[PDB]
């Protein structure tokens, strides 16, 4: 019951398998520029969050 | 190029033979490509019926 509905973030990020207790605070757009991107450099641009 | 309506959708069954899914998540022509349930990336590693 607030209207911040944009203070409460997940994540569907993949191939960042992370150990137990880890952290991994890198906020980083995902644009991988090589050939499991469809080929294509800028495209496929994964919001982390 | 010749592709029936939605209404008279079309199917294909395809089995007992080798699939080649690189091709298709390395073709640049498809606008579109999502796969639901399983990575593009996995389905060269599994065997289905």
């Given at each position: 019951k607030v209207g911040g509905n944009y203070n409460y973030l997940y994540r569907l990020f993949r191939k960042s398998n992370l150990k137990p207790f880890e952290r991994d605070i890198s906020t980083e757009?995902?644009?991988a520029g090589s050939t499991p991107c469809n080929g294509v450099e800028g495209?496929?641009?994964y919001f982390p969050l | 190029t010749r592709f029936a309506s939605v209404?008279?959708?079309n199917?294909?069954?395809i089995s007992n033979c080798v699939a080649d899914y690189s091709?298709?998540?390395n073709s640049a022509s498809?606008?579109?490509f999502k796969?639901?349930?399983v990575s593009p990336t996995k389905l060269?590693?599994?065997?289905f019926t």
């Open positions: 757009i995902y644009q495209f496929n641009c | 209404y008279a959708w199917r294909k069954r091709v298709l998540y498809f606008s579109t796969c639901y349930g060269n590693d599994l065997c």
